[PDB]
Structures are given as C-alpha cells and as structure tokens.
Design a protein around this ligand. Structure first.
Ligand SMILES: Cc1ccccc1-c1ccccc1CNc1cnc(-c2ccc(C[C@H](N)C(=O)O)cc2)cn1
Ligand SMILES: [Fe+3]
Length: 274
C-alpha cells in the first residue's frame, strides 16, 4: 500500500528526529535539534573560539579555490550570503539567518537536525523545500575533510546553490519523486542526489566545475576532484543510480552534468521509469 510520508511542511516534525568537551558540546546541538518544532525560529548559537577558528580555516582556504573550482551559480550567490548572512572568516553564520535569506530567494528553508536521517526522511524534506542541516562544527583535527556532515558543509556546500531557482527546483523534484516511493526507488533517487547535489561536477564554457556540496565544503576533495587524477563519467541516472556512494573516503568516480536545467530533465525522464 503506500508507506507514510509528510503531506505538509509541519509533518516533518514526525520524522526529523529519527574528548568529553567535544562530546558534551555535540549533545548541546543534538538537544537543540530534538526540541525544534516547525514554526520555531531556529535557535541561535554562540560558537566557541575553537569552533570559529576551525570555520575560519575552512572558509579562508575554500575561498581561495572557489573562483577557479566552483560553478558560476555558486559564485554568483556567494557575495549575497556574505552581505546579508554574516559569512566571514571570524563569524559562523546562523541557520535562522540563512533560512530567512533562502525563504525570500527560492522559498527554501532550514530545519536543524541532530543526526543522520534516512534518505527517505531527508528527501521528503526537499519536497517541501526544507533542508535538514547540522548545526555543529567539524572536529578541529581535520578541517580539510570530515567523513560526517557538519555546519560548514551545510553553510558552504549547500546554501549558496539552494539560493539559485534552477537548482532549488531540481532539488525539490527529487524530493517530490521520493514521496511514498518504493525502497528501491528511494535508493536510486538518493544515489542520483548523491552524484549531483552532493558530489556533482558540471561543464561550463567547456571547463569542469564543481557544484557538489560535499566537494565545496572539503578543501582536499575540492582540489582532488579537478586535479585531475579523478575518474569522471557523464551523468545518466539509469547508470549513475547503481554507483556505490562512498563514505569515509574520497569518491572513486564523479559525474558530470551539462547544466542544472539538463540534469533536471534527465531526472524527469528517469523517474517515469521507476
Ligand atoms: C548509505 C547510507 C547510509 C545512511 C544514510 C544514507 C545513506 C545513503 C543512501 C543512498 C545514497 C547516499 C547515501 C549517503 N548520503 C550521504 C550524503 N552526504 C554525505 C556527506 C556529505 C558531506 C560530508 C562532509 C565533507 N566530506 C566535508 O569534508 O566537507 C560528509 C558526508 C554522506 N552521506
Ligand atoms: Fe550534504
């Protein structure tokens, strides 16, 4: 019969929750996420010195690479986020500020999340233009790469492109397709999402650029993706969806889309077939 799925934005309330100093701090952010309910403003957090230092390093080094590595859409929106949301080396932007900025631009909003959601629950958020975001900062011992998403990933990887209409449409349509879909179909949609939204490359004016959020937040994988010692294939959902998504390491393969508009059409033809 059909599995449960959210029918309105507030239904997301029902799934979004499914060293010792670092540990206690993580519990703090986890508790803020767990007590959030739709309609709340997202709790604003005073970040520690060390958290800002880690952000500063990440922000400083990624901004050296963006102009030559990032797709034009990412670069177009980056300065608006500086101006309106307080993106600076010495300040971590607040999810509530970024949420409000997105609401105005593409209708996207943010909801804080404590841990990993299932791909079904995560994608279901996108159906309502809701992006579930972590609020904590990666451990200071590896600024260049982390196997778990942190707030730098959400803020630097995802938000600039969620502010772009063509890209927000693409994202929402993946979400909409997943609503009440089979387990097989959800896995394919999530893999397609992984190799576009998360780790996607694109061709712009003949050059390879990155739009994948997991790449735009990692100093070392961003450089690696365009080095180019990376194996790259054309984006094609029927083949892309079978590709294994790697956690804990760099990807073994990245997929190239022609444009956000084109990747959206490819996904449209594809979802018809599943
Ligand atoms: C396999 C799996 C298990 C549990 C939940 C979801 C999945 C699953 C199912 C289908 C497709 C993709 C996935 C995994 N999804 C994802 C998506 N993104 C990440 C991820 C994204 C960014 C980062 C941080 C980045 N490396 C950095 O250094 O900035 C680290 C991890 C990790 N996993
Ligand atoms: Fe992500």
């Amino acid at each position: 019969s059909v599995p449960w799925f959210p029918k309105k934005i507030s239904d997301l309330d029902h799934c979004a929750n499914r060293d010792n100093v670092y540990r206690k701090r993580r519990k703090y952010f986890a508790d803020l996420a767990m007590n959030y309910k739709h309609g709340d403003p997202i709790p604003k957090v005073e970040f520690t010195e060390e958290e800002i230092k880690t952000w500063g390093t990440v922000f400083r080094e990624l901004n050296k690479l963006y102009p030559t590595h990032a797709c034009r859409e990412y670069l177009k929106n980056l300065p608006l986020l500086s101006k309106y949301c307080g993106y600076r080396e010495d300040n971590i932007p607040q999810l509530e500020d970024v949420s409000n900025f997105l609401k105005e631009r593409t209708g996207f909003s943010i909801r804080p999340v404590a841990g990993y959601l299932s791909p079904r629950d995560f994608l279901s958020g996108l159906a309502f233009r809701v992006f579930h975001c972590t609020q904590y900062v990666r451990h200071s011992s590896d600024p260049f790469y982390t196997p778990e998403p942190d707030t730098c990933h959400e803020l630097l990887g995802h938000v600039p492109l969620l502010a772009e209409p063509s890209f927000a449409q693409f994202s929402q349509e993946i979400g909409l397709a997943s609503l009440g879909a089979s387990e097989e179909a959800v896995q394919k949609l999530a893999t397609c999402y992984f190799f576009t939204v998360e780790f996607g490359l694109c061709k712009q004016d003949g050059q390879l650029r990155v739009f994948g959020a997991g790449l735009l937040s990692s100093i070392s994988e961003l450089k690696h993706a365009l080095s180019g010692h990376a194996k790259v294939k054309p984006f094609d959902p029927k083949i892309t969806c079978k590709q294994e998504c790697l956690i804990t390491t760099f990807q073994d393969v990245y997929f190239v889309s022609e444009s956000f508009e084109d990747a959206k059409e490819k996904m449209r033809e594809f979802t018809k077939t599943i």
